[PDB]
Symmetry: C2
Subunit: 237 residues, 2 copies
């Protein structure tokens, strides 16, 4: 039972109204879409609890993607921020600029992408849940999760102090690993966790380097603005 | 400083001595290796805190993989159980039996693989940490993680209640998504969580369906035997 304005004529990225807390995952696919210049629409979901949405993403969160298959026979879906980067890379990164060009590049890209998807990503998600969203305060839990984030930063800092290692996965250029990691390893997010981001210098330098890319800047401007235009919810134009 | 017996002639899988609790992630790549018939060696790591091992996996955990590059010039590494599954698929699953043959198959495979990697996987790990390993016991934290596990089992159950959906990602066959999920979605794990696995019948039927496969049974039998043979540690 789909809304009237939801049509998949191309890649549709499902987001929510842009706030300080809401954009950290939805920006990831948006960065890669801007990097490759993939033609896409933005659907701002009013309620992720709406039954029509759980059909797209059964976990009932954003970002989510609908896009018709290469042959046009079926409608593809991608949900979980890591899964949306992997789909966009697969479908639109022809030369593997962000997805990797051979087995050697992909081995590292998947190591560092997966590290974020399994460690920093969920730890930071659980930190924020118990910090704000949980009905009671559990500071012993919150302290241990904060302590685990410093161990993730330690591992990222270690990697970026290896010779000529400008980016997490590859030495030469950024990848879906770097895009997936950035929003949980930059000064604004470090300050939210109550950490001094200066304690991991090569990680901070890397965060600034990624931040100065135009595709990242554009993604940050756009994701903040979604649902503050005259049309608040639904497909945007 | 590398150990003497650590030579990379083929794919080397890093494991620890088999117990009930130290095999749930190392079995994942071992299942895929058995499925595809990939030539490999087993290196039983005595201590994952060893400096030489953190040069392979900086997370200081098993499973990890060292392999030769396809050209044979260099040495690759794969760490985290999900990345080991992606590497093995990338390098050896050329026809895409478990990795997916087209964008559409890989869209759903990566969806259900990542759901495990991002949700049930970390949730289960954090439940187990606070439940056993944490110095103090935090019941409200333990109860909330267990509650999130039940929500994950709900999502898996719903998907397996869809018409003809015999496996999580694809209707027709099991993929790396199914392998990554199986160890955290079977009765023994449900028993451990304190849950009646009979509550999710379609998920239970799936767990049995996966458990019956030859490669899954060989993998479980091997991962329980590692470091209980003639050689306790190092290359077998």
């Amino acid at each position: 039972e789909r809304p009237s304005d939801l049509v998949v004529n191309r890649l549709v990225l499902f987001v929510v109204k842009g706030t300080a807390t809401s954009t950290n995952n939805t920006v990831k696919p948006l960065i890669l879409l801007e990097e490759l210049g993939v033609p896409h629409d933005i659907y701002v979901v009013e309620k992720v609890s709406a039954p029509w949405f759980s059909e797209i993403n059964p976990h009932k969160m954003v970002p989510a993607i609908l896009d018709r298959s290469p042959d046009g026979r079926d409608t593809l879906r991608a949900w979980e921020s890591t899964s949306t980067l992997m789909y966009i890379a697969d479908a639109y990164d022809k030369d593997g600029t962000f997805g990797g060009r051979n087995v050697q590049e992909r081995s590292e890209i998947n190591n560092w992408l997966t590290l974020h998807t399994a460690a920093l990503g969920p730890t930071a998600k659980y930190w924020l849940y118990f910090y704000k969203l949980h009905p009671e305060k559990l500071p012993k839990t919150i302290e241990k999760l904060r302590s685990n984030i410093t161990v993730q930063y330690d591992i990222l800092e270690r990697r970026l102090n290896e010779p000529g290692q400008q980016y997490l996965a590859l030495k030469d250029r950024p990848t879906i690993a770097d895009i997936a990691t950035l929003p949980f390893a930059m000064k604004s997010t470090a300050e939210l966790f109550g950490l001094e981001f200066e304690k991991w210098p090569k990680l901070q330098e890397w965060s600034v380097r990624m931040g100065e890319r135009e595709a990242v800047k554009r993604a940050w401007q756009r994701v903040a603005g979604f649902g503050h235009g005259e049309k608040e919810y639904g497909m945007l134009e």
